[PDB]
Amino acid sequence: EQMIQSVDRTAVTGASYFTSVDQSSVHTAEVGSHQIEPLKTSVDKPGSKKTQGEKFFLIHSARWLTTHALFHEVAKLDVVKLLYNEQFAVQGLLRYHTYARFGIEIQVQINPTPFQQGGLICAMVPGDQSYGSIASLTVYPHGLLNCNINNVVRIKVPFIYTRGAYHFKDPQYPVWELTIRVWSELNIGTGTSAYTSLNVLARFTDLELHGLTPLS
Amino acid sequence: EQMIQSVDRTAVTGASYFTSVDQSSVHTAEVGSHQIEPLKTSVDKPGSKKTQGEKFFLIHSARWLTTHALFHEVAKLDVVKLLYNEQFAVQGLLRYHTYARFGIEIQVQINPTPFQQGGLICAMVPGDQSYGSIASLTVYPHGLLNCNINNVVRIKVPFIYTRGAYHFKDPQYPVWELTIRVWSELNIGTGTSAYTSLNVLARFTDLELHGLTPLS
Amino acid sequence: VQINPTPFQQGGLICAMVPGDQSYGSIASLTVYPHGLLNCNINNVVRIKVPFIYTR
Amino acid sequence: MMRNETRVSTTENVVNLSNYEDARAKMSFALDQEDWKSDPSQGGGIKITH
Amino acid sequence: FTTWTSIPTLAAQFPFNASDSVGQQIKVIPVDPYFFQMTNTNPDQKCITALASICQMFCFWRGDLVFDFQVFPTKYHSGRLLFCFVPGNELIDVTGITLKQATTAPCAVMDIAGVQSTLRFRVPWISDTPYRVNRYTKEAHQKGEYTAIGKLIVYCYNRLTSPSNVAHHVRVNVYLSAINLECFAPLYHAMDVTTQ
Amino acid sequence: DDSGGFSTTVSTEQNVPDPQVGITTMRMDVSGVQAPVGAITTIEDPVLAKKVPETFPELKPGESRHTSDHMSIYKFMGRSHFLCTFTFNSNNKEYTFPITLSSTSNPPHGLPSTLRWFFNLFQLYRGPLDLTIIITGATDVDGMAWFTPVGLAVDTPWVEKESALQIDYKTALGAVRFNTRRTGNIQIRLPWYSYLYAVSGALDGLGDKTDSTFGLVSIQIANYNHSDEYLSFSCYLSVTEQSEFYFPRAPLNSNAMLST
Amino acid sequence: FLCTFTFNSNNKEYTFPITLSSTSNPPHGLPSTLRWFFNLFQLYRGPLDLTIIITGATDVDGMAWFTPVGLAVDTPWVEKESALQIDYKTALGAVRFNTRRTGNIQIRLPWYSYLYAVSGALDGLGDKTDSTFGLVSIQIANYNHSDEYLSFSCYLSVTEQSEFYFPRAPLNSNAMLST
């Protein structure tokens, strides 16, 4: 009397989101094993979500002149919408998913010559540039530029929204709205250059994705 | 005598791959904290590389007839090249990176009526369909279809290549080459349908990325 | 070595002690020798100490 | 089954004269390979080596 | 031989004018230890780096390279540069990359003024083959064998704002050295000035 | 599980490398009284495919008489084989032949009879070799041979012509020196100097001209000639214990096996 | 590689010095690889390792000897008659070889010099004094019968007894010449 072992047919096999329920299956026949490389051909750490999703991106720039009056708005941009573009590396994850929950890091860079004078303001505003006073923008999380002291500010903010998550392919209303106002006017003399450039850097923090979709 | 604490200026701050070396910085001023949701608005686990990268994809199909002769090649496809396309969700990670090292899972599905007879063969071949004998394809990791026994086979293979990693935007030569041959001819009678469909499923295993590039 | 720039100017120098000869060695690689770099932004005095190198 | 193989290297059959290790002989005219002892009987003990 | 290779020597030279727009590409660098472009007239000679006169005698090379950028400003200029590294080989089409498109690649910024004046930039090893061949002995091209791991781009991230009684350009020297270097398979070959 | 999936049906390990010692030896009936469960089976199950079959009452064969085994690669291919042969015609004519593992390059330019069959049974080759040459013909001829890795400047392959490289570039790579009157044989190693991981046998496209060749041997002669006697060389290869082999492959058909 | 030369008639003595100068352009001096190597540093000290290869005719008797610097010897790089007697040659130590039997000599070279160490790159009168440390000469006999060329070659090396001092800036592209 013997006992003949047979093939396995009905089980839950496959990937996580692709459940292959089969009435007929076979044992996996594959040779070898995963060898390590003692003489490595790439000395950098391999790619993942941590090294691709959270990385500073140049999304928009402006330029600050001497002829802009008081309280003029230099740059008015949507932070979330400009990140969603093919030219950045974060497109490869957000294109195939639907909902997301995230935080925003902002970095602003300018370069004054020490012959000039003036200042700016960079405040992250949620939802709307509504009827709130321009003179009280310092209640918002902001940073003050000044041609005497410093040329780089940075802002970190949590997630403030009225729903569960953001929807990329059909947005309700923009979550964050960055704004840059002329806090004091720019004054030069004779022969001093009448402009300085501006830059805005941005990245996500704590990106969480849900519900991958097949549609492009 | 007092000691006046001041602002921090020179440090390594920012994201991992964006090192913001600044001679002037400020302490981060941001309010609130990360709250959890006791009444959740999404009951699925959030997105990551594990739920987006490794998932079965339908990449190519063919159809098996009665008029195909012996040893005819039904489908001849490149496994790696067909995965690299915008219509899948794995494009969002591979578009912004350069090198990758990976393994391949294959699933083949057919559907015979029990009035027919015949069989197929599905062998994963590395590199080339070179001068090797067709009669000895069973040395390769393969799976045998049969209209009497079973209709689903699956193959798992490790990484076999002559370099460190694969290069998407400029491939050297295709790593894997799937092939499907007519192992025995298809025979019907009168009124039995003279065809059956075929499908090929595929996904990655152990995806590792290196060296993100800015170019599209 | 001592120099004195006004802060309206810009530029730099190099002061390398060379034994024996100013032979066919490249000018672009004088930093292999014991040297010191002057700069009108940073510093105006450099100093070099060397041992005895000779064939007799 | 004897197995002894030696590769013949370069500088074959070359006479060196500079040092003593290559200037010395390989065979002798003398019978029975004999050697001579010391005899300071007529020199008065004066022997020169430097 | 590492007594020569681990010491930085001057390789390249480029100015930073005050009349460039934001996103203008200043200088491209192929990443290899074979790169050098300086020369002199009296006497007639083609200058060499210390790193190029070690690796010109080997068929293969491997390891991380260290670029050192040294600026020479006054105390009163201001502006920011953006160094970017694109992985690849010595021939791709690289000037179509816009300034926003360069942030996908690994990059770093530099502030001109301050008390520091040197940026040490360590390039990682990104390749598909373990060793990268020397090809400059040969004459024809062939797809698959190369001499580089990619190229480097120098952008203008912020403009040069300055007073009137100072100059209008800041010159930058480019050094060159290596770390964790490995070569084998000796030969003889004399290099030639890469004219970029 | 690493991927977090699920599987109940298994496709097991396939084509186990080096399964059995090829000498007929022992480690009483082998088959017998018990009813054969291995007589009937299903070949489409990879689990049930590795069961040892029996149908008839058998027993142990015994032990062979010759000591060493002839079914191991390192003792089979330890015997040398043929690679190529060529002649000279005039003075200072340099010759160059590459070692090419391509299945496309038909002989005489490529691998002949035995070595063409052997190096297409597997995918990847890695490691050094062992080269022996035999001088046949005239005497009083001075020669010099050197080795050049791939991806470097060297003369054209398979073309007997003048020398186009100086004496400094030749001797820097390391060379030998021999006279046809004294020795008549050179038994030389060949190093493994290549930037890529391992060369491969059967490829197409541009992968064949890049990833096949790993070595390149050239021979220059001097003091030839006096009154015309043919100077014929031959070249014989081998394999060494440092070398490795990877990924077994389907063998060649009858039409690929050509000869000289 | 170091050098190569031929003979033409009977009893013609030849002499070549080992010179570490950067001024003496090849063929008279260091060729391609050795010219590049011995100018990467300042001071060299210690013995060498010399191999020569006889190519060409047979049945030729030869003799080679070594002379330190600062002593009387024939003119360098000039194939001419012998000007020294047999007593002065064999006192310095010599070898003996026949071209039919061996065809190779693998010989050491001693370090016999009054000064501390020779140097690579100098000018003025320091180049003609402090560069050369050795001097090798070869005399042939029984040449000839019906004219066959007798070509020699000379190959150098380095030994573990030798030393190196004071790293130096490498040569430019124009100094690296070849044969």
Numbering used by the authors:
A (entry chain B), B (entry chain B): 5 to 220
C (entry chain B): 112 to 167
D (entry chain C): 1 to 50
E (entry chain C): 51 to 246
F (entry chain A): 3 to 29, 40 to 272
G (entry chain A): 94 to 272
What does the study report here?
report the characterization of 4 highly potent NAbs: F4, F6, F7, and F9. The structures of these 5 complexes are almost indistinguishable. that these NAbs prevent HAV attachment to the permissive 2BS cell surface. binds to the BC loop of VP2 and the BC loop of VP3.
of HAV by F4, F6, F7, F9, and R10. regions of light chains and heavy chains of F4, F6, F7, F9, and R10.
